[PDB]
Amino acid sequence: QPPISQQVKELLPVLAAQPGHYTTIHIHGKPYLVTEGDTVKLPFKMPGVAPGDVLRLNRASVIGSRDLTLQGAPYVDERLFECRAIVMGTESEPMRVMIKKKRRCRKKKHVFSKHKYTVLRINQLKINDVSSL
Amino acid sequence: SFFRITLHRSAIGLPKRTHGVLAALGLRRRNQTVFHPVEPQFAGMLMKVKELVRVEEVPHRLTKRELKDERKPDAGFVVEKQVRRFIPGVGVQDEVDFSKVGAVVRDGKRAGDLGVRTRSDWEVIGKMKSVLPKVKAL
Amino acid sequence: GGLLWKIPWRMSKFQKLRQRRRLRAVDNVVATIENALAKKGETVKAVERWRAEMPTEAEMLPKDKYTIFDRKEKRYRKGIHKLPKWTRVSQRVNPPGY
Amino acid sequence: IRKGRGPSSGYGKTAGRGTKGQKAHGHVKPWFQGGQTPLIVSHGRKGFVNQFAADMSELNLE
Amino acid sequence: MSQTVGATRLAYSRVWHHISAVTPHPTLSTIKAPSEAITPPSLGRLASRIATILMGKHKPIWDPSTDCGDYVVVTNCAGLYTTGHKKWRKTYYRHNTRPGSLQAITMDALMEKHGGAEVLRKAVSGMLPKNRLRDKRLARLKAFEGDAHPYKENLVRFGGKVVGAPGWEEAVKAIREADMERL
Amino acid sequence: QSTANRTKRMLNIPPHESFLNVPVEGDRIIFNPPSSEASVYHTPFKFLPRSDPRRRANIYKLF
RNA sequence: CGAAAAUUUAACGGAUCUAAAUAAUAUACCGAAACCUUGUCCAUAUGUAACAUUAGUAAUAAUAUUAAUGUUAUUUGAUGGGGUAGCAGAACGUUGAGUGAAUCUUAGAUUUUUUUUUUAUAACUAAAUAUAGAUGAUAACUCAAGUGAGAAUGGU
RNA sequence: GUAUGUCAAAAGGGAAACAGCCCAGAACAAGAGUUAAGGUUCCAAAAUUAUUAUUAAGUGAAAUAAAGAAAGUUUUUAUA
RNA sequence: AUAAGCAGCUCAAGCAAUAAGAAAGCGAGAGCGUACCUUUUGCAUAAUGGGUCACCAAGUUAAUUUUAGAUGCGAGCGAAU
Ligand SMILES: [K+]
Ligand SMILES: [K+]
Ligand SMILES: [K+]
Ligand SMILES: [K+]
Ligand SMILES: [Mg+2]
Ligand SMILES: [Mg+2]
Ligand SMILES: [Mg+2]
Ligand SMILES: [Mg+2]
Ligand SMILES: [Mg+2]
Ligand SMILES: [Mg+2]
Ligand SMILES: [Mg+2]
Ligand SMILES: [Mg+2]
Ligand SMILES: [Mg+2]
Ligand SMILES: [Mg+2]
Ligand SMILES: [Mg+2]
Ligand SMILES: [Mg+2]
Ligand SMILES: [Mg+2]
Ligand SMILES: [Mg+2]
Ligand SMILES: [Mg+2]
Ligand SMILES: [Mg+2]
Ligand SMILES: [Mg+2]
Ligand SMILES: [Mg+2]
Ligand SMILES: [Mg+2]
Ligand SMILES: [Mg+2]
Ligand SMILES: [Mg+2]
Ligand SMILES: [Mg+2]
Ligand SMILES: [Mg+2]
């Protein structure tokens, strides 16, 4: 595996030492800025997940603190951080009706939409110690 | 080699003969990529719609399952722990922890076969009045 | 007339830039097709006609990229943005002298 | 098909007749051709029907 | 949602900015060379910068519905910079709905009655959204003819140095260095 | 606007300038002191016990 | 400059602009219900597996399988998606009828409401009000129509 | 009449407002996603982004008023 | 009670439950949107019709002649004995 930069190996301990940390995870390419304890409501029904499953997020573009920010070129290396979530079931929206209609045409075509959304819970967001790497 | 033809523009206001040229190429909707051999019959087909497509010479043809994999984003997550799940076709599938790795699916016609704790299992646990934690653990 | 078709007589520097890039993009489609065939020792009659009597964007005069020939005009010239579907149609050569 | 029971049925309002004309207001005679003379009046009827011929019941050897 | 969970007090506070219509502005001037030719910000180029402040669009929390604008004190409006012959050839028109009652006045004749501050309020007014916040935002533009104004104590300061003063930048860098002495 | 998506674009605000200088061919850490009021959990160095090794020169002095 | 018209600046959309004008160029960004990505709905296919019903065929005293219909999942990571006149298919609802001498109802049937949930022209959960044992209500399938109204200077 | 297209029966972006023009064909949502026409000082999403000249008339800047006149100005080509 | 909305839709401050728990509703402010039908090449049109609400109100039946699907019999079918 490509070795981590020396400049990243000297400032990561300073980044992990600060009180709070945030990350921008990427689910299917879409970003979500989250913190440990947040509740992400994805705009789609994740297939093949039941309430209680534990996920391991591995695509994080930015892991930063107040003053320090770790930015990977395509993404941050998975070895530096550790993020995990837990599926809290799925939620739904109130049925919204769209009425497609034209002027001087009595026909009103209806479209009924009711989508489901998977709810996550970021239960772990920690920066690893890279002294060995 | 092959021609990588991608429909950049539409033909909503162009003559009907221009629609037959895009149909022979296979371009139905916008930003659709089709692969065709480098031959005069296809080269002359592109000179009629050279204001609507983008041509590129490629060594090999890309399959249908390979043209879509270059726009597929990384999932960004890995299911590391699953819970006890009932699959209608197969049966109950016990919880598995992929971090320590086991999809065992037990099917049957009795509760004991499924691998779950039944009322009988709860009565043998209630009759074990002698079991006790070790003093050091306590 | 009373129906207002508010079409300016001249183009803007933005329309002229995209017209330059649309002419230069059709030059790459004809060069790619002509180079891919040359490797196979083949030629198309339509590709040989184009390269013969049609210029490239770098060989065109500024007045040939933004204007066309209309005989009903004072100076026999008309903005190219007045041509139907001018954005998706090829137009680079005008009568000689005009 | 119940004609005239809303737009979404597909046979509402005009009820398959379109807008106006004889074929919506009233009825066109079946034999009418717009005014052009029919081919039976331009060529005439050919032959006669034999009312005295016998109606045999054909029977074969097979 | 964490990014916006916190104290928003100071993000919605009204800051009292200051600018002089006579001081050369290297950014809002069209003559960028030589150093001696840099002109002040023209009427419309100063008004476009002020309309952005009155809307609060310079903030990262801007919302068109919320009135997160700030105050702007414009001084030295008598020497308002203008190009060409606008001062004597630009006309302002007014109508009261009664035919015949069209009132016209040149920029120089409008600066003799209400000074150059009125010419600036008309420019900034037309650059603001035409809605129910246009009069509140335009009221936070306090334009004066000379250097005197009643807001010399309201102007935002950093370490006792008013912004735009000779040594305000150095006073700001000195306060942020001490801020880094913490976890 | 007509739809919620169109309202999101008209009300857009870009991220900070520092988050736009994305690196290339590797990962890096940049000093990004925000223009905001710090909380009370960022204890000043004067209030830290002598034993606490977290006491250290300013992050600016590490770059 | 030529260049004059009658409500008001009066065809820069406006503010305003000496470029934020004009001409010859270059790059970045924004930009639609277009396209892409992740999900969902509907339509039409192609195979497979499972669940249920109905009707057969075998096995069983020491359950398996066949066919049709309905349904969910899944394979090809299937294809397709504006619409007038008009054509076609599939369903819901209303009134009455058969199964019905059936089923349920003071342990609350029914109550023009409100409320809740479900891909939802419909039904459902609960609440409130009142008090019926059948001249009450009703699932499912089926039969027949005086069967669905913001539009006729319509009628009461 | 002819050729082609749109509207008619086509919503959406641009043309200030717009049946017919320039783009583009709306099954439903999500995204600082990617683009077309068109645009990027403010109203109003995006450049007060770069290079070289011209204009001083607000000419002009998204609907070119003409012939014509003239020590307005710039450049080129001759020429003293 | 500083304002020029076919009264809806998009974003949304705030108010709203004496109390553990529990926010339907109303909504300041910002933006988008010129009713419906009929008839027309084309209507926000200053073209047609309607004061509102409830009810009545329009491809049905008969005979005759056909087609499709399903199904009974089959060189016979149907009817009737
Ligand atoms: K018909
Ligand atoms: K009730
Ligand atoms: K009327
Ligand atoms: K009826
Ligand atoms: Mg007109
Ligand atoms: Mg129809
Ligand atoms: Mg018919
Ligand atoms: Mg009619
Ligand atoms: Mg007719
Ligand atoms: Mg004007
Ligand atoms: Mg689409
Ligand atoms: Mg479509
Ligand atoms: Mg009526
Ligand atoms: Mg009446
Ligand atoms: Mg069409
Ligand atoms: Mg018509
Ligand atoms: Mg349209
Ligand atoms: Mg404009
Ligand atoms: Mg963007
Ligand atoms: Mg802006
Ligand atoms: Mg002008
Ligand atoms: Mg008020
Ligand atoms: Mg309005
Ligand atoms: Mg007419
Ligand atoms: Mg009317
Ligand atoms: Mg009735
Ligand atoms: Mg049929």
Find tokens 């007749």 and name the residue: D17
Q: State how far the Cα of C42 lies from the Cα of B117, in Å rounded to an integer.
A: 77
What resolution in angstroms does the PDB record give? 3.1
Q: Quick check: F48 and A3 in contact, CB under 8 A?
A: no
Strand H contacts (CB < 7 A) among F residues 8-27? Answer: 8-10, 12, 14-15, 20
Strand runs labelled E in chain C: 67-68, 78-79
Q: Quick check: F58 CB within 7 A of strand H? A: no
Q: State how far the Cα of F41 lies from the Cα of F19, in Å rounded to an integer.
A: 25
Read off the tokens for D8: 């979404």
Q: Helices then strands (H, E): number in chain D?
A: 2, 0
Per DSSP, A77 falls in state -
Residue of chain A whose Cα is closest to the Cα of D6? A107
Which residues have a Cβ under 8 Å from the Cβ of B39 and sit 6 or more positions away? Answer: C42
Q: Quick check: B4 and B58 in contact, CB under 8 A?
A: yes
CA distances from C43 to B36, C30, C46, C47, F40 (A): 17, 12, 9, 7, 77
Find tokens 């026999």 and name the residue: C76
- Positions of chain I reached by protein Cβ under 7 A: 2-4, 9-12, 28-32, 35-40, 43-44, 58-60
Q: Quick check: B92 and B85 in contact, CB under 8 A?
A: yes
The C-alpha torsion from F50 through F53 and F55 to F58, rounded to 10°, is 160
Chain E neighbors of A32, CB-CB under 8 A: none
Strand I contacts (CB < 7 A) among D residues 5-44? Answer: 13-17, 19-20, 24
Q: State how far the Cα of A73 lies from the Cα of F27, in Å rounded to an integer.
A: 6
CA of C73 to C1' of I13 (A): 61
Which residues have a Cβ under 8 Å from the Cβ of C28 and sit 6 or more positions away? Answer: B55
B97: β partners: B81
Chain C neighbors of B51, CB-CB under 8 A: 22, 26, 88-90
Q: Do E2 and A33 touch (CB under 8 A)?
A: yes
With 0-12 CB in 10 A as exposed, 13-18 as middle and 19+ as buried, what is E37? exposed
Q: State how far the Cα of A125 lies from the Cα of A78, in Å rounded to an integer.
A: 12
Q: State how far the Cα of C3 lies from the Cα of C48, in Å rounded to an integer.
A: 45
Which residues have a Cβ under 8 Å from the Cβ of B35 and sit 6 or more positions away? Answer: B2, B3, B4, B5, B58, B61, B62
3-state SS assignment for residue A64 = strand
Experimental method: cryo-EM
Q: State how far the Cα of C23 lies from the Cα of C90, in Å rounded to an integer.
A: 8
Distance from CA of A9 to the nearest CA of B (A): 24
Interchain touch B–D (≥3 Cβ pairs closer than 8 Å): no
CA distances from A36 to A25, A124, B82 (A): 12, 6, 21
Distance from CA of D14 to the nearest CA of A (A): 12
- End-to-end Cα spacing for chain D: 50
CA of F2 to C1' of G43 (A): 29
Q: State how far the Cα of F44 lies from the Cα of E93, in Å rounded to an integer.
A: 62
Q: State how far the Cα of A13 lies from the Cα of A4, in Å rounded to an integer.
A: 14
Q: State how far the Cα of F30 lies from the Cα of A12, in Å rounded to an integer.
A: 11
CA atoms within 13 A on the CB side of C53: 9
- C42 residue type, one letter: E
Q: State how far the Cα of A23 lies from the Cα of A12, in Å rounded to an integer.
A: 14
Interchain touch C–A (≥3 Cβ pairs closer than 8 Å): no
With 0-12 CB in 10 A as exposed, 13-18 as middle and 19+ as buried, what is A114? exposed
CA distances from E75 to E58, E111, E154 (A): 21, 15, 14
